[PDB]
């Protein structure tokens, strides 16, 4: 389905400047080192995002059920 790819694009969109500012703070001037750190941030962001999101849609699902299930 490749459904992860659209998520990455969307996550990267709202964190583009954030990851860039931090990468500049750690590796100023070194565009290559900046990109490498941004790549690490992008996947870690997705991992945390997906694990967190799953619990949120689950919380909504449990609230819709209220069946001790």
């Amino acid at each position: 389905m490749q459904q992860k790819q659209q998520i990455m694009a969307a996550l990267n969109s709202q964190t583009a400047v954030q990851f860039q500012q931090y990468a500049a703070q750690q590796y100023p001037g070194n565009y290559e080192q900046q990109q490498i750190l941004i790549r690490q941030l992008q996947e870690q962001h997705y991992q945390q995002y997906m694990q967190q999101l799953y619990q949120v849609q689950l919380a909504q699902q449990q609230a819709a059920l209220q069946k001790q299930q």
Binding site: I7, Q14, L53
Partner: protein
């Protein structure tokens, strides 16, 4: 590969009939059934998948916040 080929074959009486609308011959070669796969079953990626915000931006805010603060310590706890 977008290849295109055209061929022609004519089988008729030698009376060189021309002008009336030809109809009926429909014989083409076959090697078994034509399958059920369609033809030109290709598509071009336009990558228009994920318009506007196909995500929860608040969940993403918390997620990126934690990643950015935690990775700073992986880099070294000598700067807090």
């Amino acid at each position: 590969g977008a290849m295109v080929e055209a061929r022609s074959l004519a089988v008729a009486m030698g009376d060189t009939v021309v002008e009336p609308a030809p109809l009926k011959p429909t014989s083409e070669p076959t090697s078994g059934p034509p399958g059920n796969n369609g033809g030109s079953l290709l598509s071009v990626i336009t990558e228009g998948v994920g318009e506007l915000s196909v995500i929860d931006p608040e969940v993403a805010q918390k997620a990126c916040q934690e990643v950015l603060e935690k990775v700073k310590l992986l880099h070294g706890g000598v700067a807090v």
